[PDB]
Amino acid sequence: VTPLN
């Protein structure tokens, strides 16, 4: 899962 900035 790609983290959000």
Added chain:
Amino acid sequence: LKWSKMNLTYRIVNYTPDMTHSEVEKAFKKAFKVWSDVTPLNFTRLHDGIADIMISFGIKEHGDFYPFDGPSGLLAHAFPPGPNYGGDAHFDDDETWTSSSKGYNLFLVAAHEFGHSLGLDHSKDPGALMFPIYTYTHFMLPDDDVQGIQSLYGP
């Protein structure tokens, strides 16, 4: 994505050079209180072992293969609710973290990151805490953010 429990833990794994431990702790506590004040969520701090929300400061490649980019640009990132990296929040220490109008205000960025940690995406409302672009204007959680977090967890 959403936590299926209301009582969450966090751990401050390490600290920025930029601020005292006490000021970092104060900023993160205030940032969690933003969300606990308008939901049934509760947050407790742990000093060892595994917490739901693991918080750390790092630069460039720092362990998760989502690297930071040096000074400017990316500030921080957080993973949506889930096991392992889920919920965790990482801050780019190539930025200067403050409790002022200078550099980047750690409380404001942390409150935004913990929004992601709890399952919020970005807002299109330019005044929202969860707007994607950082600006620095007594803090009051904007109404879009109240609406968004209560949709997941209720009041």
